[PDB]
Short mmCIF file of C-alpha atoms (C1' of nucleotides) and ligand atoms in Angstrom, two decimals:
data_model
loop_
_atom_site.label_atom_id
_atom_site.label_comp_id
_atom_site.label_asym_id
_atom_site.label_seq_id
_atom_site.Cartn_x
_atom_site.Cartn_y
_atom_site.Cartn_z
CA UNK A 1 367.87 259.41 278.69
CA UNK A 2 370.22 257.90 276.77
CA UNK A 3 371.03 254.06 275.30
CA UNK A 4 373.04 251.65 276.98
CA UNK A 5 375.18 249.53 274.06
CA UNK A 6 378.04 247.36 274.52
CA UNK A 7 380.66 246.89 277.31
CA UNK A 8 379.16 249.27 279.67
CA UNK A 9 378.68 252.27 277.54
CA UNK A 10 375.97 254.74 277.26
CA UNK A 11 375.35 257.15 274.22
CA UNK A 12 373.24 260.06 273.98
CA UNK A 13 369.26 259.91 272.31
CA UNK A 14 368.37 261.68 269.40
CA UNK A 15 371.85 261.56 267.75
CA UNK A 16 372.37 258.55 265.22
CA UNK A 17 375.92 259.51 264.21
CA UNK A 18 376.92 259.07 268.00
CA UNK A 19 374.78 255.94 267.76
CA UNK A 20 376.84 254.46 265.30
CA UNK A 21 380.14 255.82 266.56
CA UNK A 22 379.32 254.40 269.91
CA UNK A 23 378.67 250.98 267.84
CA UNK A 24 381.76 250.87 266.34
CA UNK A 25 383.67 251.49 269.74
CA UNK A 26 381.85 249.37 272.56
CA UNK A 27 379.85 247.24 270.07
CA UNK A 28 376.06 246.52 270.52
CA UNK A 29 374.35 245.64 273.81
CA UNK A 30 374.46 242.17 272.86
CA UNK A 31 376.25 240.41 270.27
CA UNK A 32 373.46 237.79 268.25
CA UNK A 33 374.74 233.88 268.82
CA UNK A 34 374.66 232.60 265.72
CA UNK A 35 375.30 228.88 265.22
CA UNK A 36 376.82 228.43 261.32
CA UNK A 37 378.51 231.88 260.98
CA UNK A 38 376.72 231.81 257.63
CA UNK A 39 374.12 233.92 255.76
CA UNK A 40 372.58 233.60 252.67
CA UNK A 41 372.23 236.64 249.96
CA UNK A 42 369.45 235.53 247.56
CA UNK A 43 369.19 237.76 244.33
CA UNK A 44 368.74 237.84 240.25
CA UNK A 45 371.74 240.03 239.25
CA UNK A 46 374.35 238.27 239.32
CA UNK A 47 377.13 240.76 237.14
CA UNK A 48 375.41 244.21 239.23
CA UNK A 49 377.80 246.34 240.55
CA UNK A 50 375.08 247.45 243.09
CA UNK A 51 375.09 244.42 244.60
CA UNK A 52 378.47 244.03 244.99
CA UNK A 53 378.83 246.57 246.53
CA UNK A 54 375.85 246.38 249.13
CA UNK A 55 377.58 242.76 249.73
CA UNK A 56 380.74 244.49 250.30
CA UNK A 57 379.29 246.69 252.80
CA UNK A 58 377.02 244.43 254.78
CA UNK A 59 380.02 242.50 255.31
CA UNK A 60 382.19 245.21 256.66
CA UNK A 61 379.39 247.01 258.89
CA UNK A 62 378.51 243.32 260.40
CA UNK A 63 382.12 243.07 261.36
CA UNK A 64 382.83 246.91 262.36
CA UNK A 65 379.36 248.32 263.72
CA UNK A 66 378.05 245.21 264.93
CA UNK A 67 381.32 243.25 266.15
CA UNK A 68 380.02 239.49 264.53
CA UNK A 69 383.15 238.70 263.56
CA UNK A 70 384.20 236.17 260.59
CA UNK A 71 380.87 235.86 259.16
CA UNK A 72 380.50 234.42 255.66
CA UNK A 73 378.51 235.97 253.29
CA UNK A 74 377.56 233.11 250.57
CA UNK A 75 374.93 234.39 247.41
CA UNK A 76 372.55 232.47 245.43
CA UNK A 77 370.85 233.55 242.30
CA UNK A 78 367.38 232.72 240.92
CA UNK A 79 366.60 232.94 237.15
CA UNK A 80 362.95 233.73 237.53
CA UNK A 81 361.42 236.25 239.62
CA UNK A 82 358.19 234.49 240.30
CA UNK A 83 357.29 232.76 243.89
CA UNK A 84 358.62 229.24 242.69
CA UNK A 85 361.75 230.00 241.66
CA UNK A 86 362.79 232.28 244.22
CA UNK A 87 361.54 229.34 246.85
CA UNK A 88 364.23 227.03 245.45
CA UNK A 89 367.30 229.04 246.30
CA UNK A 90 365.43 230.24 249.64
CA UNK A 91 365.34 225.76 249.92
CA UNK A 92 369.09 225.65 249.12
CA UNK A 93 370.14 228.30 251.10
CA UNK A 94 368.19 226.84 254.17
CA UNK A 95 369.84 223.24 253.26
CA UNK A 96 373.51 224.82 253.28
CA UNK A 97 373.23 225.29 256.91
CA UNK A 98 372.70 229.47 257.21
CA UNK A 99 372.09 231.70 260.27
CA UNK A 100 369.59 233.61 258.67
CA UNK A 101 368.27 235.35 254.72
CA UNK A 102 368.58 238.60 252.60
CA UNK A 103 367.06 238.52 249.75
CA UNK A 104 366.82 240.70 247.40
CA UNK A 105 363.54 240.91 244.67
CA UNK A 106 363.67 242.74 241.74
CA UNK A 107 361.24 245.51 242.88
CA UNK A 108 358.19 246.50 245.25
CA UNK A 109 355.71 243.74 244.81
CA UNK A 110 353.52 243.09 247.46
CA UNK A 111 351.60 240.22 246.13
CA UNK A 112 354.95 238.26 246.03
CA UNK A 113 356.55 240.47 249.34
CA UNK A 114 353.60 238.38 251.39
CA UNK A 115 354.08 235.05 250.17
CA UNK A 116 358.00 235.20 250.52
CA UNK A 117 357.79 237.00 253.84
CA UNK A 118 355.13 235.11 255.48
CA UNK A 119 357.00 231.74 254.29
CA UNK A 120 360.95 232.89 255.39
CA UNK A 121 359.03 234.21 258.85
CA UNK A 122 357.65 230.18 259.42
CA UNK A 123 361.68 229.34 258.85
CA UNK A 124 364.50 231.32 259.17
CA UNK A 125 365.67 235.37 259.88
CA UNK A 126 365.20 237.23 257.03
CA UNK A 127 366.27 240.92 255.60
CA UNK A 128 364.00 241.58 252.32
CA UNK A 129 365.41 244.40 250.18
CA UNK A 130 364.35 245.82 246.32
CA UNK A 131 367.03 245.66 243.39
CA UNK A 132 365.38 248.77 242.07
CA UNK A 133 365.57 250.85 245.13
CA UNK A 134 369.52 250.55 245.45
CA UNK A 135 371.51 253.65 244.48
CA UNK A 136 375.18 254.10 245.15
CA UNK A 137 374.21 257.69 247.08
CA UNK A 138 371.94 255.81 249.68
CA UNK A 139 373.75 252.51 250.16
CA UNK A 140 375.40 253.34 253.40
CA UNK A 141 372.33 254.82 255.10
CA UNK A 142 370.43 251.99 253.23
CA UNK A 143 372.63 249.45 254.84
CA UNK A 144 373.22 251.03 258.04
CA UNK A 145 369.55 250.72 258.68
CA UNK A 146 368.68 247.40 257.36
CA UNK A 147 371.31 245.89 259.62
CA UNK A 148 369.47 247.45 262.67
CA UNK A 149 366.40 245.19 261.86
CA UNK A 150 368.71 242.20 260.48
CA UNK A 151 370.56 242.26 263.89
CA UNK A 152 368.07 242.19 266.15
CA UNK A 153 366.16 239.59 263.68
CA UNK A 154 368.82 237.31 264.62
CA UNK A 155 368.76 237.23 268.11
CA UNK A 156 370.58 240.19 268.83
CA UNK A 157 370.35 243.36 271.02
CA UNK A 158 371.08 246.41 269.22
CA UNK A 159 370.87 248.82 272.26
CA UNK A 160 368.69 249.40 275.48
CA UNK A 161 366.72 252.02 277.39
CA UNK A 162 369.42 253.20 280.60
CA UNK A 163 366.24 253.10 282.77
CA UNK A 164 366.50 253.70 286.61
CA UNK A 165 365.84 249.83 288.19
CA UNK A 166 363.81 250.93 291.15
CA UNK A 167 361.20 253.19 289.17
CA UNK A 168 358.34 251.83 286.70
CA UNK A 169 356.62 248.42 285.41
CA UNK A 170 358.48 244.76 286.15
CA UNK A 171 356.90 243.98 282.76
CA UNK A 172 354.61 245.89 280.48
CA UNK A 173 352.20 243.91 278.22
CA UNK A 174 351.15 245.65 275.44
CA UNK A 175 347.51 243.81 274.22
CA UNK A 176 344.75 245.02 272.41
CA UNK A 177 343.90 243.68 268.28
CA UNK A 178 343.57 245.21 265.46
CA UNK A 179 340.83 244.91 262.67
CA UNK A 180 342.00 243.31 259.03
CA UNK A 181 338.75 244.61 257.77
CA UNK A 182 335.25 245.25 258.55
CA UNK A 183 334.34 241.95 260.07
CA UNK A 184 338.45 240.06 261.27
CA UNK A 185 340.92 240.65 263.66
CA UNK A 186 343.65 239.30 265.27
CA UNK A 187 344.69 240.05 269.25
CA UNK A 188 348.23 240.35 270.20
CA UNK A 189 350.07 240.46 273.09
CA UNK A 190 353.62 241.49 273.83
CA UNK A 191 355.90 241.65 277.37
CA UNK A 192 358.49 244.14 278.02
CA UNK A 193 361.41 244.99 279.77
CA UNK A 194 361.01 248.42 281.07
CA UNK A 195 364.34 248.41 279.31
CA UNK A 196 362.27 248.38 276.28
CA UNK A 197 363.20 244.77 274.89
CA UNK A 198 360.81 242.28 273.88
CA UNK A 199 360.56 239.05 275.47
CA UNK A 200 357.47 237.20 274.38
CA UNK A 201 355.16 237.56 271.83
CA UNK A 202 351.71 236.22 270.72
CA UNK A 203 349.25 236.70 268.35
CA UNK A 204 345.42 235.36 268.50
CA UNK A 205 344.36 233.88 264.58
CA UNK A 206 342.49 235.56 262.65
CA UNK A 207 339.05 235.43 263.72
CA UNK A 208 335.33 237.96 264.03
CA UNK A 209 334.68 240.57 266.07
CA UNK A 210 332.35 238.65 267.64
CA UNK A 211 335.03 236.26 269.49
CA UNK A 212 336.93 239.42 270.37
CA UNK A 213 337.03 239.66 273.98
CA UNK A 214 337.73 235.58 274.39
CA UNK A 215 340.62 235.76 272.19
CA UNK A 216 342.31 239.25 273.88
CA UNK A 217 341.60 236.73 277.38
CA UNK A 218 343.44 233.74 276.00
CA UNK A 219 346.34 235.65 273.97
CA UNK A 220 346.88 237.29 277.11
CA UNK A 221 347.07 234.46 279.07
CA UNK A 222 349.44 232.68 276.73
CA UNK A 223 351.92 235.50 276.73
CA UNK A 224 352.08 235.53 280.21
CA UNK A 225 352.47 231.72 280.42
CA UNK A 226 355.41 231.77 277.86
CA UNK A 227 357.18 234.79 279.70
CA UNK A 228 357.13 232.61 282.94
CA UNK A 229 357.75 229.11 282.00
CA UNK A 230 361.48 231.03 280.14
CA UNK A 231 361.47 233.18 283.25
CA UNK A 232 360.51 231.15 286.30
CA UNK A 233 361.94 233.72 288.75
CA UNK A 234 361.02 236.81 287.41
CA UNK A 235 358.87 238.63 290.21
CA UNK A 236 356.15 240.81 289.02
CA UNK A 237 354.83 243.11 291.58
CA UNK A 238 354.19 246.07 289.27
CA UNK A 239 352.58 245.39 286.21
CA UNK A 240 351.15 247.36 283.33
CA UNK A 241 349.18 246.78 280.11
CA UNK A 242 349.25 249.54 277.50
CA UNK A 243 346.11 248.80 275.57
CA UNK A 244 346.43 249.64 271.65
CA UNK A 245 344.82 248.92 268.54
CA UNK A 246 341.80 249.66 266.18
CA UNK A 247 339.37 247.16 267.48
CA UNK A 248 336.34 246.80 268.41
CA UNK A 249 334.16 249.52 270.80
CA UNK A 250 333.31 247.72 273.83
CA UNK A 251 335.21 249.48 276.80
CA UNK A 252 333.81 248.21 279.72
CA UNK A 253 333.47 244.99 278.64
CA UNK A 254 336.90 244.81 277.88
CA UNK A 255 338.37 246.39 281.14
CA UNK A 256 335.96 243.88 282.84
CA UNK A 257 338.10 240.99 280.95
CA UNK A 258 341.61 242.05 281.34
CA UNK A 259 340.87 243.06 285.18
CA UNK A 260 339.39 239.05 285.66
CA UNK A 261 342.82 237.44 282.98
CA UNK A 262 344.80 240.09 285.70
CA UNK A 263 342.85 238.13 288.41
CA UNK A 264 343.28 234.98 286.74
CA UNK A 265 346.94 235.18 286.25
CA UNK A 266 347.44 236.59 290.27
CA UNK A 267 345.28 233.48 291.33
CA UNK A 268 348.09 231.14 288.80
CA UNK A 269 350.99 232.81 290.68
CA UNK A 270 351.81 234.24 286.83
CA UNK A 271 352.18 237.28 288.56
CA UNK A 272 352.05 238.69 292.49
CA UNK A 273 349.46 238.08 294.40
CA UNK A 274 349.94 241.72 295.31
CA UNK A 275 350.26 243.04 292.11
CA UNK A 276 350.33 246.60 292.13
CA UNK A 277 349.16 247.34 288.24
CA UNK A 278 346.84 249.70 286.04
CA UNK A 279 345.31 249.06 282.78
CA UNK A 280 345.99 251.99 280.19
CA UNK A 281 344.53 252.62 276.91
CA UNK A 282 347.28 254.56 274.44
CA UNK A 283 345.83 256.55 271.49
CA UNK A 284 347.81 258.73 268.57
CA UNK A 285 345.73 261.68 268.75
CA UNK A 286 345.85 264.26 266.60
CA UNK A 287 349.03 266.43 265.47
CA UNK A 288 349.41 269.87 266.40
CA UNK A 289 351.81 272.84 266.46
CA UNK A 290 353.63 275.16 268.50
CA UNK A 291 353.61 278.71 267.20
CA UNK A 292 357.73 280.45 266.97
CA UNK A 293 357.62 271.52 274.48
CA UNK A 294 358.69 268.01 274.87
CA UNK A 295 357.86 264.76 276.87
CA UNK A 296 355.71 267.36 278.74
CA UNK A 297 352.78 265.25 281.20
CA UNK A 298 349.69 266.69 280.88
CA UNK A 299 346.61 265.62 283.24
CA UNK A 300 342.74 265.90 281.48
CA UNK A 301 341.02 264.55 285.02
CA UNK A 302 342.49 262.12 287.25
CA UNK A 303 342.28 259.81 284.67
CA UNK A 304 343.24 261.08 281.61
CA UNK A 305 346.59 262.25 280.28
CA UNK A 306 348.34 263.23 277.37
CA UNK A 307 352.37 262.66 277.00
CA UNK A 308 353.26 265.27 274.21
CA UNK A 309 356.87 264.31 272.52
CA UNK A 310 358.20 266.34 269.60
CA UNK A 311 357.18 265.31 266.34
CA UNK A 312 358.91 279.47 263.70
CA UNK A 313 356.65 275.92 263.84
CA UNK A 314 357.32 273.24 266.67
CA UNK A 315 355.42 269.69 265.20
CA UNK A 316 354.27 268.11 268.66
CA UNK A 317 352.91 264.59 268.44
CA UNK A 318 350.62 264.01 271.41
CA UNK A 319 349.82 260.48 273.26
CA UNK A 320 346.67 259.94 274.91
CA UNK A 321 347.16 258.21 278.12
CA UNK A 322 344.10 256.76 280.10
CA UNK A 323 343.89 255.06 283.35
CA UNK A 324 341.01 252.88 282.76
CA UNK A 325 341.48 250.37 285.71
CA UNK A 326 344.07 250.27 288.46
CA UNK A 327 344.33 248.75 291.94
CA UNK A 328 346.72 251.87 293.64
CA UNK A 329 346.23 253.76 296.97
CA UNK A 330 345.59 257.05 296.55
CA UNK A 331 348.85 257.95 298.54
CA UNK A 332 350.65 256.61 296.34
CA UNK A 333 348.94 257.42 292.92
CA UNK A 334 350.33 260.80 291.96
CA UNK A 335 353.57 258.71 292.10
CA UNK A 336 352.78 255.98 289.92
CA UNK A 337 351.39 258.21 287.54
CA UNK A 338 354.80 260.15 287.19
CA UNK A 339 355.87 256.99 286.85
CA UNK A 340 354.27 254.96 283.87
CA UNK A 341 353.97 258.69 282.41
CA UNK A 342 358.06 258.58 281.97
CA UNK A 343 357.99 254.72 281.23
CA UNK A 344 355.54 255.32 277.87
CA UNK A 345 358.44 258.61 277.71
CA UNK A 346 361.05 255.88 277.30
CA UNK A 347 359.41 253.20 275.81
CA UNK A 348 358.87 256.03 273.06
CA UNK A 349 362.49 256.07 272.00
CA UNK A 350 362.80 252.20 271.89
CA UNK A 351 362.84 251.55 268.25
CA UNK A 352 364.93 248.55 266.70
CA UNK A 353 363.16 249.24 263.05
CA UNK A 354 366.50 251.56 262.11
CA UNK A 355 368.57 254.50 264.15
CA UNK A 356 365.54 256.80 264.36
CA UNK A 357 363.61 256.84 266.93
CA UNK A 358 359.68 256.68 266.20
CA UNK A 359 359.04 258.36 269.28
CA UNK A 360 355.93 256.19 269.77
CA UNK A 361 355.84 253.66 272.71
CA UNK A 362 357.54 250.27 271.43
CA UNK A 363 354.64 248.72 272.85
CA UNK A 364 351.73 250.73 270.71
CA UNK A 365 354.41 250.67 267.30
CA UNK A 366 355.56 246.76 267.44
CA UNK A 367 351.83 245.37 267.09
CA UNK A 368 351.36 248.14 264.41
CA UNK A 369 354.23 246.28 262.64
CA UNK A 370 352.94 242.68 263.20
CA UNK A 371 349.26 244.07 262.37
CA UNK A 372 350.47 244.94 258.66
CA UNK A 373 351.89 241.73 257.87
CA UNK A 374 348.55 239.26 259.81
CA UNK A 375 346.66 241.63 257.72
CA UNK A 376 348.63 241.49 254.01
CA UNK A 377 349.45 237.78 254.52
CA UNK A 378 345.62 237.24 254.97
CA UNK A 379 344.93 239.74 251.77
CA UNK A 380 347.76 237.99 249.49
CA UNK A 381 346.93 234.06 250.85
CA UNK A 382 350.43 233.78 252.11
CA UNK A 383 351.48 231.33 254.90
CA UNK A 384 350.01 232.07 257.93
CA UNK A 385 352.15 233.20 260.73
CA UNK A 386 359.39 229.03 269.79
CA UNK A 387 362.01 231.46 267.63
CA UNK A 388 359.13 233.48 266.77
CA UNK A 389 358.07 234.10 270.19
CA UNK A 390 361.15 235.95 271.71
CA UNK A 391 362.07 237.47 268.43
CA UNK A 392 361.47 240.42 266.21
CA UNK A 393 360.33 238.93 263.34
CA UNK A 394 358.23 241.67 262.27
CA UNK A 395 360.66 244.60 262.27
"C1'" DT B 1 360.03 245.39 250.66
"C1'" DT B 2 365.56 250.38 254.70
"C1'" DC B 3 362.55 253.74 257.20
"C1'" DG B 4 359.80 257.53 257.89
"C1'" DA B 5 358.73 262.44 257.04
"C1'" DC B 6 356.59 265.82 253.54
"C1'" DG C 1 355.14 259.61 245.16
"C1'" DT C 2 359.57 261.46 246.33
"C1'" DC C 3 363.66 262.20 249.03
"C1'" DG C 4 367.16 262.70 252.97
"C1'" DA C 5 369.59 260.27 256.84
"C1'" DA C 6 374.55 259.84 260.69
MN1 MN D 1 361.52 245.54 258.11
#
DNA sequence: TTCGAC
DNA sequence: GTCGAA
């Protein structure tokens, strides 16, 4: 494996100083649009040399690693740091005509973190950072990082999985929900490229777990709608779902569902009418060690698997892989599981969160991300959650 | 809320 | 919590 970026070059995985090299060089796979050439940097420390200086440097690695040329950086300062008064230069920022926000709050505060976040998500871009948190000995890593997730917040394309065309999924929807508490959840649903990039997102309200499977039906549904009406002629003749998410227990019931929205969708001409595609449940299982290997398949019965991926001690962080429905012929099944075995294998190193790779499908880790902030927002009353949709909002 | 491991 | 990353 390794990541296609910019201009037709590929770098190597696992190496972030290549990563960034190979930045600087060829540029990212695809350079964000942006339509004033203008963001906004919203803090409360206005003589700080630390900010200057993280200023100084987002606007040299936009330009160098990330090849958006003559952006302007413009600042505005609140007095207070309460939710009103940071608000008002968010307002003034967004009325100066800006591409997209980093703000900066004076420290970790999650009450405020919700209200600010779940409001700039409803508008506009944003990059939060923590005035405390800066140091002069972490500002480049610190930056380098941040601008991963601000990049790709804008619209842009950091890097890609080089995936062979001709092998694994036309799109993978990752679905499931996740429980807020004892009693709410939310479904999501998410297509991918097997290339690893998003391109449609959607996420059920909040609601019980007694509406459960209706909601996972319709969010479903919708995703798929969304992908198509943007993407009218792509085909999808192999399709998988990689089914995530602390929710409720009720596994028959719920293969039953997503094999009739599969149905559905096939009858819709969503997707193929000869749809070749399996339904997989993906579960972090627990660590273990290997006493002094990696993306190693391993086969439980014919239809469980584990995909073990490194984590005198070797950490190994194992992937439990289940074929719970699935319309192949048994010719050509020992195939296709090679197959969406190596795909959750690459969709592992698909992170756009910083340079490191989570190594944990993109599909399984995104609606972990979007699952903390449904779930705070809710906690904190915040502002509940067509930019949002084929962004990364929640990175 | 840099992220993510210890 | 605390710290190290190309
Ligand atoms: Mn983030």
């Amino acid at each position: 494996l390794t990541y296609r970026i910019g201009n037709g070059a590929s770098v190597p995985i696992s190496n972030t100083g290549e990563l960034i090299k190979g930045l600087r060089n060829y540029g990212p796979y695809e350079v964000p649009s942006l339509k004033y050439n203008q963001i906004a940097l919203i803090h409360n420390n206005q003589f700080s040399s630390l900010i200057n200086q993280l200023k100084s440097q987002i606007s040299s690695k936009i330009d160098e690693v990330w090849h958006i040329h003559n952006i302007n950086i413009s600042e505005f300062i609140y007095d207070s740091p309460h939710f009103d008064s940071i608000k008002s230069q968010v307002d003034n920022a967004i009325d100066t005509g800006v591409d997209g926000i980093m703000l900066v709050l004076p420290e970790y505060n999650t009450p405020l973190y919700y209200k600010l976040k779940s409001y700039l998500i409803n508008s506009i871009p944003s990059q939060f950072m923590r005035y405390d948190i800066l140091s002069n000995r972490n500002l480049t890593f610190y930056v380098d990082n941040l601008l991963v997730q601000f990049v790709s917040k804008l619209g842009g394309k950091p890097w890609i999985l080089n995936v062979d065309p001709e092998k694994g999924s036309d799109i993978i929807i990752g679905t499931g929900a996740t429980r807020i508490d004892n009693v709410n959840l939310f479904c999501f649903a998410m297509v991918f490229k097997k290339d690893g990039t998003m391109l449609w997102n959607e996420i059920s309200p909040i609601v019980t777990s007694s509406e459960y499977l209706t909601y996972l039906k319709s969010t479903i549904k919708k995703v798929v709608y969304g992908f198509k009406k943007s993407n009218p002629d792509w085909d999808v003749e192999k399709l998988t779902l990689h089914v995530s998410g602390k929710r409720p227990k009720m596994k028959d019931g719920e293969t039953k569902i997503l094999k009739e929205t599969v149905e559905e969708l096939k009858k819709q001409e969503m997707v193929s009418r000869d749809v070749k595609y399996a339904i997989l449940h993906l579960n972090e299982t627990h660590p273990f060690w290997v006493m002094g290997y990696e993306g190693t398949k391993v086969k439980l019965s014919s239809k469980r698997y584990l995909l073990t991926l490194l984590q005198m001690v070797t950490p190994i962080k194992p992937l439990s892989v289940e074929i719970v429905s699935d319309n192949w012929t048994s010719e050509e099944y020992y195939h296709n599981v090679h197959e969406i075995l190596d795909e959750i294998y690459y969709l592992s190193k698909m992170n756009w969160r910083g340079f490191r790779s989570r190594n944990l499908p993109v599909t399984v880790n995104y609606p972990k991300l979007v699952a903390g902030i449904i779930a705070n927002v809710n906690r904190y009353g915040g502002y509940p959650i067509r930019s949002l949709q084929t962004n990364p909002w929640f990175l």
